[PDB]
Structure formats: C-alpha cells, structure tokens
Structure 1
Amino acid sequence: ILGGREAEAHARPYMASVQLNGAHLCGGVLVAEQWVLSAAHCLEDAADGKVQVLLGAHSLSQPEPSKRLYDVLRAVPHPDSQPDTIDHDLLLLQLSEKATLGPAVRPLPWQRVDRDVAPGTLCDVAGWGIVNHAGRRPDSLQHVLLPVLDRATCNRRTHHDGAITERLMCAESNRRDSCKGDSGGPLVCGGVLEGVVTSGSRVCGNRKKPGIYTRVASYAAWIDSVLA
C-alpha cells in the first residue's frame, strides 16, 4: 500500500497473507471457515513451491498468539482467468482444516447484491505490499481508505480506456493506492467485502491510473459453487 498507515493490530480479522515458501506473495480474505479468497494470478509462478495462508497476523515475522500458518489442500483459480488479462481474477484456497476462529480470525461477509456502490464511497484496503517506489516491504499490515471512482471516469481513454467491465470496479489512486503484493486483498465498504485487488501489474499511486478491483458480487455463483 502506497501512502497508507500501519493498521490497528487484528482489527481486520479476515485479513490473510498468501505465502509461497513462507514469503508474502498476495493478500487474501477469509470468506468461510475453510476458504480464503485471493487473486487468480497470485500462484502463476508457484507450482514448485509450498502455498500457505497466514491468518490472525499483524506482523509477518513476530510471534502473536492468534497467528497461524495454514497449509492449503486445494487452489482453485477462476476457470475463465488467463494470464495477461484482468478478467475473472479470483482464486479460492481451501485450507487444510477449518480455521480456528476468535476475535483476531473471522470471515468477512461478502457482497452478493450485484449493483454498484455510490461514487465516492469510502472503502478500506489493507495489505503487506510495497510501501514506496524503492519497493520497501512492511513487516506489519498497512491500510488506506480510498473513494470509489465511477466506472465511466475509470474507462476514459486517459485512464483504463474501456477495460473496466461491469465485473470490475475502480478506486481513486492519487498517492494513496494498492500496489505490488496487495493483489488478492480485500476492498471493504460498509463492513462487507466488495472487491479483490487485481493481479496485474499496473502503475501505483498515479491519480490518472486508478486502482482496479474485481467485484465479488459479480462472481457470487462461482464462489458459492467452489465453497460448497
């Protein structure tokens, strides 16, 4: 996250770190007792390595009582996703057992009503992604509050030039922004999961190039089918 602040520890008990060989790779969101939602392309370069999900964390490195690193039984990228597109950019990870729940580990309710938010709606995005142009990596979870940017503006030739389908949404990116390593993490509005940070490399913090997030409501049937 560019331009953000250190999150209150454990105040987002849904927040997950998706890891490859014990290193943070992507954000994710606990959406059911045994399932974490993330971004499709998070595991693009993984097959030779161990995929795990860290729940209950604030610091990536320090011991905390609620921190637990779960193994993954199965990874389910969206079957329509393709490398080098932004569409269908969702991933479901089934943990090796149900997560132990408590004040610091809890699933987030997620949006099933497929309608847009009001422009300007203030949403929260959190992550352990880079925090500056030099690529500095935070030990602890960061966050930013971002207004939603209307799709028409987001689609103009100067911005994302027609690439924002009805299945995607945008948030402003003026200095405050998601960036590398925040892929897969949650965009939360009104205490409900609305979006998932996209995987595609994209420039960070340029107001002219808004953040892109996959709308979870647009994929409710897929999520339900996999979860079941």
Structure 2
Amino acid sequence: IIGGHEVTPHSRPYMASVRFGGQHHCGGFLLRARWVVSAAHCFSHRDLRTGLVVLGAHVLSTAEPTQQVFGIDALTTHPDYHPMTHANDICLLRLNGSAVLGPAVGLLRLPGRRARPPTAGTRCRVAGWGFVSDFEELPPGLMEAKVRVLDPDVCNSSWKGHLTLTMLCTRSGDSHRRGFCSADSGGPLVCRNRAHGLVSFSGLWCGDPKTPDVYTQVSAFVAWIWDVVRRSS
C-alpha cells in the first residue's frame, strides 16, 4: 500500500494473506468461513500445494495468537480470465477447513446482486501487506490507504482507452500518491462496508495518478461468486 497507514492490529478482520513458499504474495478477503476471494493473476503458474491462506494476521512474520492458517482445497479462477487480456481478474479459494470467526477473523460483505458500482468521489479504503514504495519496501504490518472512486471515463482516458466495463478506478483525496502496490492484489476496496473492488493492476509507478489504480468491479461478479460457492456447498 502506498500513502497509507498501519491499521490497529486485527481491526480489518476479513483480510487474508495468500502465501507461497512461506512468503506473502497476495491479499484476499474472507467471504464465508471456508471461502476467500482473491485475484486470479496471483495463482498463475503456481503450485497450489505450496500455498497457504493466513487469517487473523497483523504482522505476518510473527506467529501471532490470532492467526488461523489454511491450505487451499480448490481454486476456481473466473472462467473468462485469460492471458492477452486484463479483465476478470478474480478467483475463489475454498479452504481445507473452516475459520473460527471471532474478534480477529470475520467476514466482508459483497455488494448486493442489484447494486451499482460506487459513484465518483465515493470515499473507500484499501488494505494490504504489499510494498509501501517503488523500492520493494515491506510494511511493518497490515496497512490501509484512503482513496476515492475516480470517474471511469477519466480513468479510461488516462489508460489510453484500455479499460473495460467491469473495472473501476481510484485516486488519492489529496496531492499525495495513495493506492496499492505489488502483493496487494486480491485485497478488497471497501466502500460503505462492502467489497466494491478487488485490487488488480496499475502502472509503472505505484499510486501514480497518471496510471490510476484499477480494481475488478466486484458487483459484476457477485452472481458468479455465489454460483461457485453454492456449487461446492
């Protein structure tokens, strides 16, 4: 996260760390006790058996008492996620056990099946354990930045016309760079206590207003998410 601040430990209890070979690689959130939403690009060419999902964390390098660690029983990547395109960057992880919900481990709600994406200017927050600079600096624990939804036409022009209808963008509320960076992927953009976005991609410099942060527009995927969950329940 760029231009953010360390959260109070366990104050975002839906946040998940996806780790490969013991190393944090992506974010995600707890949808149901056995289900985590993350970004499809995080799993490309990855041996799933080397993956773990860590819930209840603040400092990932410490074996904290609130941490609950799970293997991935099943990865379901969006059926329309593909190379040579950036859209549909979303997946579900069915965990090999069920989280015990409590003060440090809880669920984040999706937008409603009939909900629209948030209007430009809407205040949201994005959290993660990704880099805090363009020099691959690690955070001391879970970080969060305050951002605002950016007009999709303005975002699309800044991206030289390459955005699709199921993408949404943000900007900083002020003159500082604020947004996500590498290994924040799959974390939610939370607006009004709903997961309206999922961290997907940005430009050469993290948080650069020339290349606005792009999220998967989660409301477009709600029906599919529930289809997958119901399917294996």
Q: Which TM-score band applies after superposition, normalised by the shorter structure?
A: over 0.9
TM-score between both structures, scaled by the size of structure 1: 0.94
- Give the CA deviation at 1:47: 2.1
Counterpart of 1:177? 179
Q: Structure 1 stretches (4+) deviating beyond 4 angstroms?
A: 199-202
- Give the CA deviation at 1:200: 6.5
Do residues 86 (structure 1) and 71 (structure 2) align? Answer: no
TM-score between both structures, scaled by the size of structure 2: 0.92
Counterpart of 1:133? 134
Return closer, same or farther for 1:49/1:138 CA change in 2, 3 Å cut-off: farther
Amino acid paired to 1:25:
H
Amino acid paired to 1:35:
W
Do residues 154 (structure 1) and 161 (structure 2) align? Answer: no
Counterpart of 2:218? 216
Counterpart of 1:37? 37
Deviates more, 1:128-137 or 1:109-118: 109-118
- Give the CA deviation at 1:83: 2.5
Is this contact kept in 2: 1:41–1:83, CA < 8 A? no
Counterpart of 1:194? 196
Counterpart of 2:166? 167
RMSD: 1.5
Output the CA distance in 2 between the equivalents of 1:48 and 1:143: 27
Output the CA distance in 1 between the equivalents of 2:135 and 2:84: 25
Amino acid paired to 1:69:
V
- Give the CA deviation at 1:146: 0.2
SS in 1 for 2:139: coil
Could you report, residue by residue, the CA deviation over 1:150-177 in whole angstroms, capped at 9, with x for unpaired residues?
Answer: 1011111xx1122222211000155111
Output the CA distance in 1 between the equivalents of 2:62 and 2:170: 32
User: What is the aligned residue count?
Assistant: 226
Deviates more, 1:48-57 or 1:22-31: 48-57
- Give the CA deviation at 1:185: 0.5
- Give the CA deviation at 1:93: 0.4
Deviates more, 1:143-152 or 1:105-114: 105-114
- Structure 1, unpaired ranges of 5+: none
Counterpart of 1:102? 102
Amino acid paired to 1:206:
D
- Give the CA deviation at 1:37: 0.3
Residue identity (%): 42
- Give the CA deviation at 1:51: 1.1
Is this contact kept in 1: 2:202–2:213, CA < 8 A? no
Is this contact kept in 1: 2:133–2:206, CA < 8 A? no
Output the CA distance in 1 between the equivalents of 2:124 and 2:39: 19
Is this contact kept in 2: 1:21–1:49, CA < 8 A? no
Deviates more, 1:132-141 or 1:193-202: 193-202
- Give the CA deviation at 1:29: 0.6
Output the CA distance in 1 between the equivalents of 2:21 and 2:220: 32
Could you report, residue by residue, the CA deviation over 1:191-221 in whole angstroms, capped at 9, with x for unpaired residues?
Answer: 1111100056653121111100011110112
Counterpart of 2:118? 117
